[PDB]
């Protein structure tokens, strides 16, 4: 079912969904590469209890790139220049027990752009949900180490100042990677990232890199001063 | 009679004649091969070289006159099959 | 082997195949989106029992789209503007005992175009065969419910009159979808539908939609009066 | 790691790799379809002779095609016009005990072109390695039969003088194919071969064909005199 359509304003209202949906559909007239500052926040609200926070002001570009990695991609039509489907649960729809609802908010929108929302429900209910987390590496520092145990997918910002990225696996081995080699390995799993309206296909974003982490327990970033390096990680767990 | 002694893939010594038309050239080996010796006019010659193929080990083997051992040359030095090789024999 | 080459006539002569072919290759200089009225009819004449009707005047576009869903897609070359490989058996080829033979015919062609037929054999023989059927929803019917149990793939004509389409699954749940949501879900399985000669890919037809039916036992169509709707369904069964 | 960069000279020096690597990244500013004569040679020097040969002057185009068959394909960027990741081991990386080293050589390079070779390290070790072999025809005989048992992938040259290709399977059946049918079947498992920098995709080289060999024990070529037909076969085995 359709959730909302936003135009003119720069901040969507806190939309409430009571029907148990399994996935979201994001459509807009701006290409995936043209997204600059739009942010999305999704959570589950309980009438008597503690809220469930899935995404908190996560960049829409990072959200789409995380949710559309694999065989699928983001498509486009004549009316919409960007259509993406983002999964919320594992193999079904989120189950609302007694007084649960789904609150969705879009913020930092552009004045003259249209953003639609659609919901997709499934005939099955599951307790597995996807959680998004954000990590940062400052600009005044040289190198950092971040623990990425438990996650299975990350999205890192791309800058011309990153020197080395080191993976520490579950068996203690350490492997160093150049940004070019890491990009080549990333494209070795998903050759195509998006398909344009005319027919041309774009195989990656110039300022974003998608890293599939398998049995990796640590990531070490080595760079120089000048910019902030942002990571967005995704995990699956039961609530 | 101009002919070359060469070893095939299975390290077997064989003899193949040379076509003297428009120069000295060999082709159609059908198997990976390593040229061992060259005979021009039923005599052994030294100082030959290839004007189109760059391969130091075969030149080193050909130029030496003493007996050689086939246990020291590996499969790496073998030239690919159906290779056209030209000779520049001094005279 | 090569079966026939049709050029100039509006009706291909009946073609008889005796060898146990496994698949057909359709090649033509007409683009996939440009086919209008070409129809195919394939049936096996058996000397012990009853004749087996596989396709009974099925439109060429629907027949091609029914067989190229998944990883495969229709391709093109310099000489041929459209090449498609359509399978007629599950894994092997059709079993012909002594004199039973396949018969293929093409109808409603264009005089100034070209068509070809090629046959592909397999080292193994099987009794599992693919059948194509047609369902219709009249212009004066507001809604219609059909039983798609046993089917695994459908092709529908996209029309502005269709408002809603509801899946009924085995567990009993009924889920309603809009045409936009149906198209988005369909494009998440096979992102690319065809590749043209100039390198531009097309991700779908502007008038045809392909629906994969997994664990679906009923389809309900809700629309407005005025237009007729046609579904082309595929199934696999052992003869 | 950055193994080497070659520019200006027509022959790369004997590149030596000491640490354990599992895959090679080959990048160039020349397109995949424009490779004509460049060749590669890779081997492992175990010691006093008895070195292991993985590739002996194999054409670069055939080496790239035989390693990027399946979901993946060659890549392109705004700085490099061709990128290819070719694996050398089954699951992990080559294991060198005390003094073994991997020697890589490039031959017949273009004077005014740039090439770059990178090596990819892996946290695992394995003894299953890929071997490339070459087979040809005398070009003065009409037909020839070769045995392709064990090999799981072949790259054949394409010419207009090749009439028939006969496949003999493990169960004794013999199936005859034409070049058009062979190409159609080949493009059914790997629809896309390469993606260009601008956005166009090429679905197949005009003079090379990739044949997957499953349960195939013999290949017979029926051709005409005037050209040399070349097959490059890839196999996996334990050293």
mmCIF file of N, CA and C in Angstrom, chain A residues 3 11-21 24 39-47 49-58 63 88 94-96 99-107 117 129-132 239:
data_model
loop_
_atom_site.group_PDB
_atom_site.id
_atom_site.type_symbol
_atom_site.label_atom_id
_atom_site.label_comp_id
_atom_site.label_asym_id
_atom_site.label_seq_id
_atom_site.Cartn_x
_atom_site.Cartn_y
_atom_site.Cartn_z
ATOM 1 N N UNK A 3 2.164 4.843 1.258
ATOM 2 C CA UNK A 3 2.315 5.461 2.570
ATOM 3 C C UNK A 3 2.138 6.969 2.457
ATOM 4 N N UNK A 11 10.725 18.643 5.152
ATOM 5 C CA UNK A 11 10.711 17.712 6.279
ATOM 6 C C UNK A 11 9.385 16.971 6.281
ATOM 7 N N UNK A 12 9.437 15.656 6.100
ATOM 8 C CA UNK A 12 8.230 14.843 6.111
ATOM 9 C C UNK A 12 7.719 14.671 7.540
ATOM 10 N N UNK A 13 6.404 14.621 7.732
ATOM 11 C CA UNK A 13 5.865 14.354 9.069
ATOM 12 C C UNK A 13 6.141 12.921 9.497
ATOM 13 N N UNK A 14 6.016 12.689 10.801
ATOM 14 C CA UNK A 14 6.263 11.366 11.371
ATOM 15 C C UNK A 14 5.124 10.437 10.970
ATOM 16 N N UNK A 15 5.320 9.703 9.878
ATOM 17 C CA UNK A 15 4.287 8.825 9.351
ATOM 18 C C UNK A 15 4.185 7.549 10.176
ATOM 19 N N UNK A 16 2.951 7.132 10.444
ATOM 20 C CA UNK A 16 2.663 5.960 11.257
ATOM 21 C C UNK A 16 2.031 4.878 10.393
ATOM 22 N N UNK A 17 2.532 3.653 10.526
ATOM 23 C CA UNK A 17 2.012 2.492 9.818
ATOM 24 C C UNK A 17 1.574 1.464 10.849
ATOM 25 N N UNK A 18 0.328 1.009 10.733
ATOM 26 C CA UNK A 18 -0.218 -0.015 11.613
ATOM 27 C C UNK A 18 -0.243 -1.395 10.975
ATOM 28 N N UNK A 19 -0.361 -1.471 9.653
ATOM 29 C CA UNK A 19 -0.293 -2.752 8.968
ATOM 30 C C UNK A 19 1.130 -3.291 8.997
ATOM 31 N N UNK A 20 1.256 -4.586 9.268
ATOM 32 C CA UNK A 20 2.565 -5.227 9.348
ATOM 33 C C UNK A 20 3.171 -5.325 7.955
ATOM 34 N N UNK A 21 4.175 -4.497 7.681
ATOM 35 C CA UNK A 21 4.835 -4.480 6.388
ATOM 36 C C UNK A 21 6.163 -5.214 6.499
ATOM 37 N N UNK A 24 10.135 -1.685 2.367
ATOM 38 C CA UNK A 24 9.793 -0.344 1.922
ATOM 39 C C UNK A 24 10.202 -0.161 0.468
ATOM 40 N N UNK A 39 17.867 12.262 4.761
ATOM 41 C CA UNK A 39 18.040 11.318 5.853
ATOM 42 C C UNK A 39 16.714 10.647 6.178
ATOM 43 N N UNK A 40 16.800 9.397 6.626
ATOM 44 C CA UNK A 40 15.636 8.581 6.949
ATOM 45 C C UNK A 40 15.802 8.031 8.359
ATOM 46 N N UNK A 41 14.691 7.950 9.092
ATOM 47 C CA UNK A 41 14.678 7.381 10.435
ATOM 48 C C UNK A 41 13.459 6.484 10.567
ATOM 49 N N UNK A 42 13.689 5.206 10.861
ATOM 50 C CA UNK A 42 12.630 4.214 11.002
ATOM 51 C C UNK A 42 12.759 3.579 12.377
ATOM 52 N N UNK A 43 11.635 3.433 13.077
ATOM 53 C CA UNK A 43 11.662 2.729 14.351
ATOM 54 C C UNK A 43 10.301 2.103 14.624
ATOM 55 N N UNK A 44 10.277 1.221 15.619
ATOM 56 C CA UNK A 44 9.070 0.532 16.057
ATOM 57 C C UNK A 44 8.685 1.088 17.417
ATOM 58 N N UNK A 45 7.458 1.591 17.514
ATOM 59 C CA UNK A 45 6.950 2.210 18.729
ATOM 60 C C UNK A 45 5.995 1.258 19.433
ATOM 61 N N UNK A 46 6.227 1.049 20.725
ATOM 62 C CA UNK A 46 5.364 0.246 21.577
ATOM 63 C C UNK A 46 4.623 1.156 22.547
ATOM 64 N N UNK A 47 3.331 0.885 22.733
ATOM 65 C CA UNK A 47 2.529 1.731 23.604
ATOM 66 C C UNK A 47 2.993 1.707 25.047
ATOM 67 N N UNK A 49 6.213 0.200 26.774
ATOM 68 C CA UNK A 49 7.488 -0.493 26.724
ATOM 69 C C UNK A 49 8.574 0.422 26.186
ATOM 70 N N UNK A 50 9.643 -0.207 25.709
ATOM 71 C CA UNK A 50 10.806 0.491 25.184
ATOM 72 C C UNK A 50 10.788 0.458 23.661
ATOM 73 N N UNK A 51 11.139 1.587 23.049
ATOM 74 C CA UNK A 51 11.140 1.695 21.599
ATOM 75 C C UNK A 51 12.217 0.802 20.993
ATOM 76 N N UNK A 52 12.008 0.423 19.735
ATOM 77 C CA UNK A 52 12.974 -0.369 18.981
ATOM 78 C C UNK A 52 13.529 0.520 17.877
ATOM 79 N N UNK A 53 14.818 0.831 17.948
ATOM 80 C CA UNK A 53 15.452 1.759 17.019
ATOM 81 C C UNK A 53 16.204 0.955 15.968
ATOM 82 N N UNK A 54 15.754 1.049 14.718
ATOM 83 C CA UNK A 54 16.413 0.368 13.607
ATOM 84 C C UNK A 54 17.410 1.290 12.912
ATOM 85 N N UNK A 55 16.930 2.422 12.401
ATOM 86 C CA UNK A 55 17.773 3.430 11.777
ATOM 87 C C UNK A 55 17.457 4.788 12.384
ATOM 88 N N UNK A 56 18.501 5.564 12.668
ATOM 89 C CA UNK A 56 18.358 6.880 13.289
ATOM 90 C C UNK A 56 19.102 7.902 12.434
ATOM 91 N N UNK A 57 18.351 8.651 11.625
ATOM 92 C CA UNK A 57 18.907 9.700 10.768
ATOM 93 C C UNK A 57 20.013 9.156 9.867
ATOM 94 N N UNK A 58 19.779 7.977 9.303
ATOM 95 C CA UNK A 58 20.740 7.362 8.397
ATOM 96 C C UNK A 58 20.585 7.981 7.017
ATOM 97 N N UNK A 63 21.464 3.968 3.090
ATOM 98 C CA UNK A 63 20.374 3.021 3.304
ATOM 99 C C UNK A 63 20.082 2.227 2.036
ATOM 100 N N UNK A 88 13.227 -4.897 5.409
ATOM 101 C CA UNK A 88 13.203 -4.598 6.837
ATOM 102 C C UNK A 88 13.387 -5.827 7.710
ATOM 103 N N UNK A 94 7.442 -7.647 9.726
ATOM 104 C CA UNK A 94 7.596 -7.441 11.160
ATOM 105 C C UNK A 94 6.280 -7.738 11.864
ATOM 106 N N UNK A 95 6.361 -8.485 12.962
ATOM 107 C CA UNK A 95 5.185 -8.917 13.706
ATOM 108 C C UNK A 95 4.915 -7.938 14.842
ATOM 109 N N UNK A 96 3.723 -7.350 14.845
ATOM 110 C CA UNK A 96 3.299 -6.422 15.883
ATOM 111 C C UNK A 96 2.419 -7.173 16.875
ATOM 112 N N UNK A 99 0.509 -3.482 20.833
ATOM 113 C CA UNK A 99 0.277 -2.077 20.515
ATOM 114 C C UNK A 99 1.469 -1.496 19.771
ATOM 115 N N UNK A 100 1.995 -2.242 18.807
ATOM 116 C CA UNK A 100 3.180 -1.837 18.070
ATOM 117 C C UNK A 100 2.794 -1.124 16.781
ATOM 118 N N UNK A 101 3.595 -0.123 16.422
ATOM 119 C CA UNK A 101 3.426 0.603 15.170
ATOM 120 C C UNK A 101 4.800 0.900 14.591
ATOM 121 N N UNK A 102 4.832 1.268 13.312
ATOM 122 C CA UNK A 102 6.078 1.590 12.625
ATOM 123 C C UNK A 102 6.076 3.078 12.309
ATOM 124 N N UNK A 103 7.053 3.802 12.848
ATOM 125 C CA UNK A 103 7.182 5.234 12.630
ATOM 126 C C UNK A 103 8.327 5.492 11.661
ATOM 127 N N UNK A 104 8.033 6.229 10.590
ATOM 128 C CA UNK A 104 9.005 6.553 9.552
ATOM 129 C C UNK A 104 9.045 8.064 9.378
ATOM 130 N N UNK A 105 10.252 8.614 9.260
ATOM 131 C CA UNK A 105 10.435 10.049 9.095
ATOM 132 C C UNK A 105 11.524 10.312 8.065
ATOM 133 N N UNK A 106 11.277 11.275 7.180
ATOM 134 C CA UNK A 106 12.258 11.740 6.209
ATOM 135 C C UNK A 106 12.589 13.195 6.507
ATOM 136 N N UNK A 107 13.878 13.526 6.516
ATOM 137 C CA UNK A 107 14.312 14.871 6.864
ATOM 138 C C UNK A 107 15.454 15.301 5.952
ATOM 139 N N UNK A 117 6.704 6.978 -0.770
ATOM 140 C CA UNK A 117 6.931 5.825 0.087
ATOM 141 C C UNK A 117 5.858 4.780 -0.169
ATOM 142 N N UNK A 129 15.163 -8.839 12.384
ATOM 143 C CA UNK A 129 15.126 -7.486 11.854
ATOM 144 C C UNK A 129 16.540 -7.023 11.544
ATOM 145 N N UNK A 130 16.618 -6.004 10.692
ATOM 146 C CA UNK A 130 17.875 -5.410 10.262
ATOM 147 C C UNK A 130 18.109 -4.109 11.015
ATOM 148 N N UNK A 131 19.316 -3.952 11.551
ATOM 149 C CA UNK A 131 19.716 -2.772 12.301
ATOM 150 C C UNK A 131 20.883 -2.095 11.599
ATOM 151 N N UNK A 132 20.825 -0.768 11.524
ATOM 152 C CA UNK A 132 21.854 0.045 10.895
ATOM 153 C C UNK A 132 22.584 0.863 11.952
ATOM 154 N N UNK A 239 14.458 -9.418 17.904
ATOM 155 C CA UNK A 239 13.967 -8.534 18.953
ATOM 156 C C UNK A 239 12.780 -9.170 19.663
#
